[PDB]
Write a protein that binds this ligand. Structure first.
Ligand SMILES: NC(=O)c1ccc(I)cc1
Ligand SMILES: NC(=O)c1ccc(I)cc1
Lengths: 262, 302
């Protein structure tokens, strides 16, 4: 019913598809970053997963933060010593936008082990706001997932959580995931989750909605399927640990399929 | 953000919000009359306020002739200046001073139709307003009315998640919020607009409660106490109590006596208990009530 805004969901889907291209980071920014690497970014994101967990933040908040970070690093060159400061301010801004009860600034200062000062975090908050020009209402993977979820027949929580999980794993690895739009990673995530749990495939009804097919999703899906298979071996483990929790139905303990057969 | 404060001349104070004051100002180069909202950040020890972050981020992408236009944002180290399109008055002040023997039916119809256009645009762009009330509806000399004050607004996902409770000024607050419901949606904006419709006709608030429970009771006594038939789920709601008095629904023609059949029809659909059955802004635009509106559509702003 109204919680799924029947009268507006298509308008909204269309709008998000337009806004996801505008809020997209530059696919090749890390090569132009003299002092930071994909691996450092990965450590940062992993830590922001932990921060989200420590403060029981929404997953939406985590996704916004990563978006803010990647857009910022697209135009601003950053020394390794200051990457965490960008991340911290991004998490604060994302919290203030998405959270009912955002953690206070002091708690953000706290989790950085007093590497930075209250004033440093605050000054960085303004810089991100200026760089992004307050374009904070970005489409995320999750915004798309939750609408795709409405096409399950019937709803299945393992499917939902597993898709959430796979989408989260994608935030960690700028290569290759920077090359895909939220709507596509979400598509791939939903289809992989669906297949793993139920053996079913990306629904026709979502081909109607999205215009995407297994064909158009195929590249992304192959990457996500690798990321899933290797997930126990990745240097970064905070998402796996998080998705062991029963809140997410222990989905990180499911077995990835050895093949997609398509 | 090409603006500079050097280019504005302040003209007079016009109002005061939470983090500051609003001046009518004049662009010294273009001639444009704007409203400047100041938001001091030096005072703020928690950095840029979340209200302001939501207002700016959300108003950026809401370009619509019935939504007040954010023209620019100036960001000093100690101050933040939102530059808005200037509208001379709000609906509350218009009802108090000039609408003494009432608003003409033509003008009420026009205002309602424009408010629905504005609100439909918000929902189409995944924004709940969450504070629709006459104070927050600005009117110009040309006959336009526009949604304003997006300090309480929020970007929603589909389906919606749990957001902040007890939102919306009490008199305009929907039953589902009053009953502590886990989830609320676009239907809370419609309820407000419905209260506003009634208010434009009578020039008094429809449900002037002095507490959460008093607000409910007033609503119940006007539309009847809802049960499982009119509203499936109601009795399972977190702050629903079996002890609630059971008032009979009085005939809707008694709620707003001067109102015609078309008017009553549309009002009832805006004030439907079940958020799922309540009319959407998009559907309400096609209601017969509006058949004879001809006021030319307001023009977008740059
Ligand atoms: N946009 C405006 O003209 C305006 C905004 C807020 C107030 I309080 C008064 C006027
Ligand atoms: N909050 C109150 O004061 C109140 C709550 C429930 C009833 I039944 C009456 C009053």
């Amino acid at each position: 019913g109204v919680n799924e805004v029947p009268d507006y969901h298509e308008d909204i889907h269309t709008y998000l598809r337009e806004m996801e291209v505008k809020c997209k980071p530059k696919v090749g920014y890390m090569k132009k970053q003299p002092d930071i690497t994909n691996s450092m970014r990965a450590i940062l994101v992993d830590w922001l997963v932990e921060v989200g967990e420590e403060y029981k933040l929404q997953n939406e908040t985590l996704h916004l933060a990563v978006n803010y970070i990647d857009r910022f690093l697209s135009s601003m060159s950053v020394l390794r010593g200051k990457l965490q400061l960008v991340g911290t301010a991004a998490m604060l801004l994302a919290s203030k936008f998405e959270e009912i009860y955002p953690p206070e600034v002091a708690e953000f200062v706290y989790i950085t082990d007093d590497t930075y000062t209250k004033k440093q975090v605050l000054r960085m908050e303004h810089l991100v706001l200026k760089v992004l020009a307050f374009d904070l209402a970005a489409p995320t993977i999750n915004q798309f997932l939750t609408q795709y979820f409405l096409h399950q027949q019937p709803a299945n929580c393992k499917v939902e959580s597993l898709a959430m999980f796979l989408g989260e794993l994608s935030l960690i690895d700028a290569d290759p995931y920077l090359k895909y739009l939220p709507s596509v990673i979400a598509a791939a995530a939903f289809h992989l989750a669906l297949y793993t749990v139920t053996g079913q495939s990306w629904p026709e009804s979502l081909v109607q909605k999205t215009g995407y097919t297994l064909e158009t999703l195929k590249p992304c899906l192959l990457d996500l399927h690798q990321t899933y298979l290797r997930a126990p071996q990745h240097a970064q483990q905070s998402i796996r640990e998080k998705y062991k929790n029963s809140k997410y139905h222990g989905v990180s303990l499911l077995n990835p399929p050895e093949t997609l057969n398509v | 953000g090409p603006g500079s404060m050097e280019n504005f001349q302040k003209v007079e104070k016009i109002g005061e919000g939470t983090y500051g004051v609003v001046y009518k100002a004049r662009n010294k180069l273009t001639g444009e009359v704007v409203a400047l909202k100041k938001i001091r950040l030096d005072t703020e020890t928690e950095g840029v306020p979340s209200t302001a972050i939501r207002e700016i981020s959300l108003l950026k992408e809401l370009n619509h002739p019935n939504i007040v236009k954010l023209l620019d944002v100036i960001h000093t180290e100690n101050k933040l200046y939102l530059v808005f399109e200037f509208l001379h008055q709000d609906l509350k002040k218009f009802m108090d001073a000039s609408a003494l023997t009432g608003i003409p039916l033509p003008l009420i119809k026009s205002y309602l139709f424009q408010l629905l256009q504005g609100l439909a645009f918000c929902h189409s762009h995944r924004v709940l307003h969450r504070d629709l009330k006459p104070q927050n509806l600005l009117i110009n000399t040309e006959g336009a009315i526009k949604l304003a004050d997006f300090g309480l607004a929020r970007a929603f996902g589909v389906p919606v998640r749990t957001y902040t409770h007890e939102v919306v000024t009490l008199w305009y607050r929907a039953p589902e919020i009053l009953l502590g419901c886990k989830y609320y949606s676009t239907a809370v904006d419609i309820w407000s607009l419905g209260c506003i419709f009634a208010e434009m006709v009578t020039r008094r608030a429809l449900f002037p409660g002095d507490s959460e429970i008093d607000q409910l009771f007033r609503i119940f006594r006007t539309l009847g106490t809802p049960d499982e038939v009119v509203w499936p789920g109601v009795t399972s709601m977190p702050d629903y109590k079996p002890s609630f008095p059971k008032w009979a629904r009085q005939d809707f023609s008694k709620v707003v006596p001067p109102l015609d059949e078309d008017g009553r029809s549309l009002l009832s659909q805006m004030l439907h208990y079940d958020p799922n059955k309540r009319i959407s802004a998009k559907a309400a635009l096609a209601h017969p009530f509006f058949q004879d509106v001809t006021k030319p559509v307001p023009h977008l702003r740059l």
